[PDB]
Amino acid sequence: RIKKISIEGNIAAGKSTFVNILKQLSEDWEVVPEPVARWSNVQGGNVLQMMYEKPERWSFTFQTYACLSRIRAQLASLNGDAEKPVLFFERSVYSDRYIFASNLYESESMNETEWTIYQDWHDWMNNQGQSLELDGIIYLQATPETCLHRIYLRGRNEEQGIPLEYLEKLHYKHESWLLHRTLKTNFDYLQEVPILTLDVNEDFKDKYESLVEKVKEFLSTL
Amino acid sequence: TRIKKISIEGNIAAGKSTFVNILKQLSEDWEVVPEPVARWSNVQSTQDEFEELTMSQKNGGNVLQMMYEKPERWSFTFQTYACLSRIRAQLASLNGKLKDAEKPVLFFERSVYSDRYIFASNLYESESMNETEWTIYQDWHDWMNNQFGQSLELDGIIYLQATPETCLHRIYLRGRNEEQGIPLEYLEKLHYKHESWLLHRTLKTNFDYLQEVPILTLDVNEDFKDKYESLVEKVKEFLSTL
Numbered sequence A: 001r002i003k004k005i006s007i008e009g010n011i012a013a014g015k016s017t018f019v020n021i022l023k024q025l026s027e028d029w030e031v032v033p034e035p036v037a038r039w040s041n042v043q044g045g046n047v048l049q050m051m052y053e054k055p056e057r058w059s060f061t062f063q064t065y066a067c068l069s070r071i072r073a074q075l076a077s078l079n080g081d082a083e084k085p086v087l088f089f090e091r092s093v094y095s096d097r098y099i100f101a102s103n104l105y106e107s108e109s110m111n112e113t114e115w116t117i118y119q120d121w122h123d124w125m126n127n128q129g130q131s132l133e134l135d136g137i138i139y140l141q142a143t144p145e146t147c148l149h150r151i152y153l154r155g156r157n158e159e160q161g162i163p164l165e166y167l168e169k170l171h172y173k174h175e176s177w178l179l180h181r182t183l184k185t186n187f188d189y190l191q192e193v194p195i196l197t198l199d200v201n202e203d204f205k206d207k208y209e210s211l212v213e214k215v216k217e218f219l220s221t222l
Numbered sequence B: 001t002r003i004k005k006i007s008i009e010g011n012i013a014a015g016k017s018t019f020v021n022i023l024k025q026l027s028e029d030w031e032v033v034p035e036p037v038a039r040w041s042n043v044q045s046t047q048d049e050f051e052e053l054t055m056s057q058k059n060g061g062n063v064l065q066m067m068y069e070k071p072e073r074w075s076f077t078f079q080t081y082a083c084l085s086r087i088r089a090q091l092a093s094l095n096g097k098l099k100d101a102e103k104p105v106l107f108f109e110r111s112v113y114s115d116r117y118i119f120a121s122n123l124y125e126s127e128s129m130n131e132t133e134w135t136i137y138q139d140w141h142d143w144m145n146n147q148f149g150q151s152l153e154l155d156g157i158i159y160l161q162a163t164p165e166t167c168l169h170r171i172y173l174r175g176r177n178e179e180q181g182i183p184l185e186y187l188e189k190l191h192y193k194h195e196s197w198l199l200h201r202t203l204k205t206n207f208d209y210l211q212e213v214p215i216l217t218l219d220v221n222e223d224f225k226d227k228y229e230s231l232v233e234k235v236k237e238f239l240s241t242l
């Protein structure tokens, strides 16, 4: 019943900022924030930090918890009577698996066993899920350079050592999935989901007017 | 459902598969969900529908071996997969077996409760899971049980009690490769966890109904022929009380 729109894009592209703006446009519109605070303080251990520090040890543990915490929050938001309700997800279980987890496996931060377990867990976990299927995707496109700068602006302690090259790899995965559309998932419906690509490289005064209305254009078509 | 759910609990090589797979012949209304141990020693995920036509399903990793070789590294990963693969197998069997049976009884080889309160809990207590790992695991376990509500709830538990020494001997008899280095001390710690949960019933769990769930305790230390009759009798009596 609720339209579910995922906001995708690289680390610090400006997804939280944008959706928190967008949501004031309508009482019918709510956000499900990416549960990053629950990753910083496991409840507490900093599993986010452990993964950045020791990715060969902690990537699988991190990735499983990330995805579980997202499903939990997204499902909780669907449960709690509006004209045209829209729920904006900050990222999705598909970016969890096909971007982040996948990149860790490609980097050898998860081994073949860990990647197999992750995929089997993800397959089953989402096959139960079901009510989380997306009606649309908004891709906020920023260059890895922009993302690096915004990382510094925001000042999340765990993120400060992130190298440009890591952001580059993440950028290429997003481009393969959402712009080139060469990234194959095993979720069949996903190949028919409309994607709205917004460029957010400029300082926010420069284009935010046009961006909000593009989202308005987009949502009325779903 | 109308299906009665009975868990069979007990230590490694106590004789649960053997007993229950012979017992289930006694009625066409009785079926078993085996423990997915083969899925743990050969880790595999689903093939794409076109890929499976031209590529074999290959032997994957052995997370069971990895856990035994290095518990402090692999325990969390193993326990998470163990529990997921169990829930998958049990749910599928609930929604598919014993359709139109008169008095259906599904016997589970162990339960999600033993996954958490025996095995995972033992690993945490042995410093094979750290606080972060143990917190994550418990949180995931809690959430999954909330989800299914009463689906997997047990009507009864059968506890097959065997000494750690007996279990150790039976491990050798069975000769599962990954179990061959298991020391008496590990079996003993597991034993004490079962006794607290099922016999003395002092072990507290996050699931209130468990404290009331009926438990049958069977001593399975004797050679199989020596007690089987008596055991079958006790199980039939127990089931008629549920």
Ligand SMILES: Nc1ncnc2c1ncn2[C@@H]1O[C@H](COP(=O)(O)OP(=O)(O)O)[C@@H](O)[C@H]1O
Residues within 6 Å of the ligand: A009, A010, A011, A012, A013, A014, A015, A016, A017, A018, A150, A151, A153, A154, A200, A201, A202, A203, A204, A205
């Ligand atoms: N368009 C923009 N122009 C200038 N700063 C931005 C812009 N979008 C986001 N920022 C700033 O960049 C940082 C990252 O934005 P945030 O929305 O937290 O990213 P994300 O949610 O994608 O990780 C924050 O400090 C934010 O205020």
Ligand SMILES: Nc1ncnc2c1ncn2[C@@H]1O[C@H](COP(=O)(O)OP(=O)(O)O)[C@@H](O)[C@H]1O
Residues within 6 Å of the ligand: B010, B011, B012, B013, B014, B015, B016, B017, B018, B019, B170, B171, B173, B174, B175, B220, B221, B222, B223, B224, B225
């Ligand atoms: N009562 C018994 N007497 C002699 N052998 C037994 C008895 N119960 C089980 N066994 C043998 O012990 C080994 C372990 O039994 P199994 O049913 O596989 O244990 P579990 O399922 O509890 O791990 C097997 O080799 C099996 O044939």
Ligand SMILES: Nc1ccn([C@@H]2CS[C@H](CO)O2)c(=O)n1
Residues within 6 Å of the ligand: A010, A011, A012, A034, A036, A048, A063, A066, A067, A095, A096, A097, A100, A101
């Ligand atoms: N499944 C996910 C989701 C997000 N991330 C990273 C680490 S936290 C940061 C939030 O943008 O993104 C991640 O590494 N894996």
Ligand SMILES: Nc1ccn([C@@H]2CS[C@H](CO)O2)c(=O)n1
Residues within 6 Å of the ligand: B011, B012, B013, B035, B037, B064, B079, B082, B083, B114, B115, B116, B119, B120
């Ligand atoms: N959650 C579980 C379930 C079973 N085990 C062990 C390893 S496999 C063996 C089968 O009896 O038991 C375990 O270590 N953890």
